[PDB]
Design a protein around this ligand. Structure first.
Ligand SMILES: N[C@@H](Cc1ccccc1)P(=O)(O)C[C@H](CC(=O)O)C(=O)O
Ligand SMILES: [Zn+2]
Ligand SMILES: [Zn+2]
Length: 393
């Protein structure tokens, strides 16, 4: 059979656990959670990267649904609860296809019955409003990882896409990591500064993840992971879930985006300005310089290097579907994973290597978080510390 046929067979046995899909935010923004208007039991290819049929075609067996909210708007906690509610509603609406999962055991139970294990990951520490009790409440509601920052610093952690702030994690930031360890919530180091990555690795007694990050050695961008950090994963026990975002994974796209941003500033606009006037400037840039397009090969290049440095036991996949506007050719939506698996087969990845990449590493890591949590919950009570106490006024 072809490598694509083989890939599909392999995925039927050990499907993809995808680390980060932003369907909930997409539903919030497109239809304000009017789920009938974007029914994922129907074909949503006109509007979304994700629906149930495409998930199954793509060999997705578990999904961390992102409950991302904006850090630059007030009411982050309320919005996070709305995102969590969206995931809950999706699970309730589609019991034939989805199963809520809170534990590694739930993930295996879902796989045994042929349902997609549905987990939740918060994207940015702003979702807890500097409150450890709020962190505990998110865990109680089913959140199983939290990205420590999004694109901006918060009070206790530095983002890779902001200026240096506290220098990595503050004292309270370390306390957040300790509490995540006690609860059993995975520390997600996507988005965070390299300083923050190192501080989190120093502090965490549980395996950490990167829910959607690729390789900085392959493509120098702050959203990607440095080799020195990848090297620490085997000791930590964690895993880096490669992402598909073209402006992170393809050198030409990184360069293009930098030039686009410079061009915006040259016209007196902030690079993130979305006004009609700014859009005109950007359109003119894209007219003289077409947007470069990544491929499955681009993503495989990252995985090859990440495997060499981190080890095959410390890799996963985090597509960022419905969280980013552009995709590599062959990975245009959630049905695309078999194309990546086929490319890796062609590059000599073994069946057991690939079962680790798709399924086994993610289950091991969540089980490890649970194991560490058992020890810490037995050893001490929850923290009552405040950011004022630890970081000062
Ligand atoms: N939650 C998404 C941001 C978002 C998307 C839509 C409306 C608001 C916020 P993201 O963080 O998952 C995507 C981003 C790449 C990009 O911007 O393309 C990255 O991961 O670094
Ligand atoms: Zn992100
Ligand atoms: Zn996201």
């Amino acid at each position: 059979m072809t490598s694509l046929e083989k890939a599909r067979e392999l995925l039927r046995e050990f499907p993809v656990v995808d680390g980060h899909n932003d369907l909930p935010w997409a539903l919030r923004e497109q239809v304000r959670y009017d789920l009938d208007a974007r029914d994922i039991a129907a074909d949503q290819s006109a509007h979304l990267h994700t629906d149930l049929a495409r998930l199954r075609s793509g060999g997705v067996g578990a999904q961390y649904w992102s409950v991302y909210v904006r850090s630059d708007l007030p009411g982050a906690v309320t919005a996070t609860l709305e995102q969590i509610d969206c995931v809950r509603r999706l699970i309730d609406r589609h019991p034939g296809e989805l199963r809520a999962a809170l534990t590694a055991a739930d993930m295996e139970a879902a796989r045994a019955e042929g349902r997609i294990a549905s987990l939740m990951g918060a994207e940015g520490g702003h979702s807890i409003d500097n409150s450890l009790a709020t962190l505990r409440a998110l865990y109680a509601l089913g959140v199983r990882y939290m990205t420590l920052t999004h694109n901006d610093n918060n009070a206790w952690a530095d983002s890779a896409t902001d200026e240096p702030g506290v220098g990595g994690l503050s004292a309270f930031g370390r306390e957040v990591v300790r509490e995540m360890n006690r609860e059993g919530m995975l520390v997600d180091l996507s988005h965070v500064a390299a300083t923050t990555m190192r501080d989190a690795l120093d502090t965490s007694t549980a395996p950490v993840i990167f829910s959607h990050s690729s390789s900085r050695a392959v493509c120098d961008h702050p959203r990607n992971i440095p080799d020195d950090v990848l090297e620490r994963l085997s000791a930590n026990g964690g895993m880096a879930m490669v992402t598909f975002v073209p402006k992170f994974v393809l050198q030409a796209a990184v360069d293009w985006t930098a030039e686009a941003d410079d061009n915006m500033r040259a016209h007196g606009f902030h690079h993130l300005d979305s006004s009609p006037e700014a859009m005109k400037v950007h359109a003119a840039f894209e007219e003289r310089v077409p947007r470069p397009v990544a491929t499955v090969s681009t993503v495989a290049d990252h995985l090859d290097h990440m495997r060499e440095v981190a080890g095959v036991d410390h890799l996963g996949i985090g597509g960022d579907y419905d969280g980013t506007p552009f995709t590599p050719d062959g990975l245009g939506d959630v049905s695309g994973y078999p194309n990546l698996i086929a490319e890796l087969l062609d590059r000599g990845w073994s069946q057991s290597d690939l079962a680790k990449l798709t399924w086994k590493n993610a289950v091991r890591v969540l089980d490890a978080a649970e194991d560490v949590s058992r020890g810490l919950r037995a050893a001490r009570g929850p923290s009552n510390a405040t950011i004022e106490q630890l970081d000062g006024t």
